[PDB]
Every structure is written in structure tokens, then in C-alpha cells.
Design a protein around this ligand. Structure first.
Ligand SMILES: *Cc1ccc(-c2[nH]nc3ccccc23)cc1O
Length: 278
């Protein structure tokens, strides 16, 4: 409920827009450096004359983000700057998203990294539903952020209350709710674990939808050395009948989640080695 201030790492700094140097573009997102400390941050510029639809989704994503300060698996907001013509939203800068990480990798992402990712994203979605009654509705690799510090976080929620390729069967053919995001996460995990989107050779959005309904769930291959727990977690996420798909409280008890809650995985070192191979 305050503006003109940046809170980074518990410390509050009085700030204006002029205290920030524009380091280039990444709705408009800028990479920017806070001159008072050297902190490099991401800054969204919501123009007052901008699109009402985009500005609505920006204000909606910010509203959820401001509520999520006590969740370590959601990208955080440092503060805002309100001028006569713009609103600048200061977000913590992450390294990349899982989609760009897949293309730069040009291959499968290891299971040990996807386990830490599954833990963070499931706890992020569980926090959203339980603490704020929020359903994400658009879980996909481009909304999973990772940084050099090893952190994995879910990012801005324009549609928090959808991409066709990750729609659950019950969103395509509604019987007439969080479990639909469980399906999207299962599809993202298969895509990131194989390096290939599961429903291949689709030229239209509708063709993707027919494959989600007409074909069996695209589970993990049994010849990549995937652990039995990982294959079990994916198969549960990809249960086509949503009435039997597990909710978040049951997924959080899964042995796949329990292993990577306590297992030391150096996501930071693996992340910097991948990005070094540009
Ligand atoms: C490729 C890439 C790089 C950075 C980010 C990112 N870092 N912090 C963010 C806050 C809000 C939205 C996006 C952010 C994303 C991304 O895809």
C-alpha cells in the first residue's frame, strides 16, 4: 500500500524513477539497475494511456504478487513508482524461464532439476489456492522462472482467479478446478523431461485439443532412466478424468515431492553451467 520505495532483502530504500538506470528491454518490461545499491531488477512499465485489457491483467497480477510476500516460490515485488503518466512495478530479476531454458538446452532437463522445480511450483500453486483462493489457469514452462542462485519461482498471474497446448481435458470438454492446473504441470514436466512437446506435429490449436481428448495421456518414457517416483508423479498429474486427478494436498504427499524436499540439489551450479553453453 506504499509507493516510491524499494524493499530488497529486508532493507527499505527511498527511491524515485530517476534512481534507476535502464539497461534494456527484456506491457513493457525493463532490466534496470538501482543506482543506490547496484541491485539489478526487472521493472514493468504500465503506461497510463496503455491498453485497458493489458493494464487490467497487469494490475491483477500485481495484486496477487503483493499478497504473496510470504511465499518463497512466487516472484516477488520490491515496490512501485506512480507518476502522472506511468506505473513502474519493480520485480525481482530471474535468470530465465523454463521454456527458454529448454531451447537453450536443446535437450532434456535432468530429473533432479525437475524435482526441485516440481516442489517449488506445486507449493506455489498450493499457496495461491489455500491462502488467496486463486487458481493460476495458465501453468506452462514460460511461467516457471529460475535464477543463478538456484531459486525456482512461479511468475505473474494475469488470468489468476489459458494456453491451448496445456489445457486439461475438462477445460476442453467441460462436464458442467485447481486440478486443471495439475494437468498443465504434468504436460510441462513431460515436455521439459523429454525436450519435446508431447502432442507433436500439430498445426492448429484445435488439433492439439483433439489429441488431448482422443489420445492416451502422454506419460514419461520408460527408457530415459526416469525414477519410478517421477513416472508415478507424472502419471497422476496426467489422469484424464479430473474427478480422479489428485488435488495439491495429495500431490504434496507424493514420494517424488518428498524426495526433493530434503535432497540437496545444486540447481545454482547446474544453471550457470547451462547458460555458459550459450
Ligand atoms: C527469459 C526471462 C528472463 C527473466 C524473466 C523474469 N525475471 N523476473 C521476472 C518478473 C516477472 C516476470 C518475468 C521475470 C523472465 C523470463 O522469461
Amino acid at each position: 500500500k506504499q509507493t516510491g520505495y524499494l524493499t530488497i532483502g529486508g532493507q527499505r530504500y527511498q527511491a524515485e524513477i530517476n534512481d534507476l538506470e535502464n539497461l534494456g528491454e527484456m506491457g513493457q518490461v525493463w532490466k534496470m539497475r538501482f543506482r543506490k545499491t547496484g541491485h539489478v531488477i526487472a521493472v514493468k512499465q504500465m503506461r497510463r494511456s496503455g491498453n485497458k485489457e493489458e493494464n487490467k491483467r497487469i494490475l491483477m497480477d500485481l495484486d496477487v504478487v503483493l499478497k504473496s510476500h510470504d511465499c518463497p516460490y512466487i516472484v516477488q515485488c520490491f515496490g512501485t513508482f506512480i507518476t502522472n503518466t506511468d506505473v513502474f512495478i519493480a520485480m525481482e530479476l530471474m535468470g530465465t524461464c523454463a521454456e527458454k531454458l529448454k531451447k537453450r538446452m536443446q535437450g532434456p532437463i535432468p530429473e533432479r532439476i525437475l524435482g526441485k522445480m516440481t516442489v517449488a511450483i506445486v507449493k506455489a500453486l498450493y499457496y495461491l489456492k489455500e491462502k488467496h483462493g486463486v487458481i493460476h489457469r495458465d501453468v506452462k514452462p514460460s511461467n516457471i522462472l529460475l535464477d543463478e542462485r538456484g531459486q525456482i519461482k512461479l511468475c505473474d498471474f494475469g488470468i489468476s482467479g489459458g494456453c491451448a497446448a496445456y489445457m486439461a481435458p475438462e477445460r476442453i470438454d467441460p462436464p458442467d478446478d485447481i486440478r486443471a492446473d495439475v494437468w498443465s504441470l504434468g504436460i510441462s514436466l513431460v515436455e521439459l523431461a523429454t525436450g519435446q512437446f508431447p502432442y507433436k506435429n500439430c498445426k492448429t490449436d484445435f488439433e492439439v485439443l483433439t489429441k488431448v481428448l482422443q489420445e492416451e495421456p502422454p506419460l514419461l518414457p520408460g527408457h530415459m532412466g526416469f525414477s519410478g517416483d517421477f513416472q508415478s508423479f507424472v502419471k497422476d498429474c496426467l489422469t484424464k478424468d479430473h474427478r480422479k486427478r489428485p488435488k495439491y494436498n495429495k500431490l504434496l504427499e507424493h514420494s517424488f515431492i518428498k524426495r526433493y524436499e530434503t535432497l540437496e540439489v545444486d540447481v545454482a551450479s547446474w544453471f550457470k553451467d547451462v547458460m555458459a553453453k550459450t
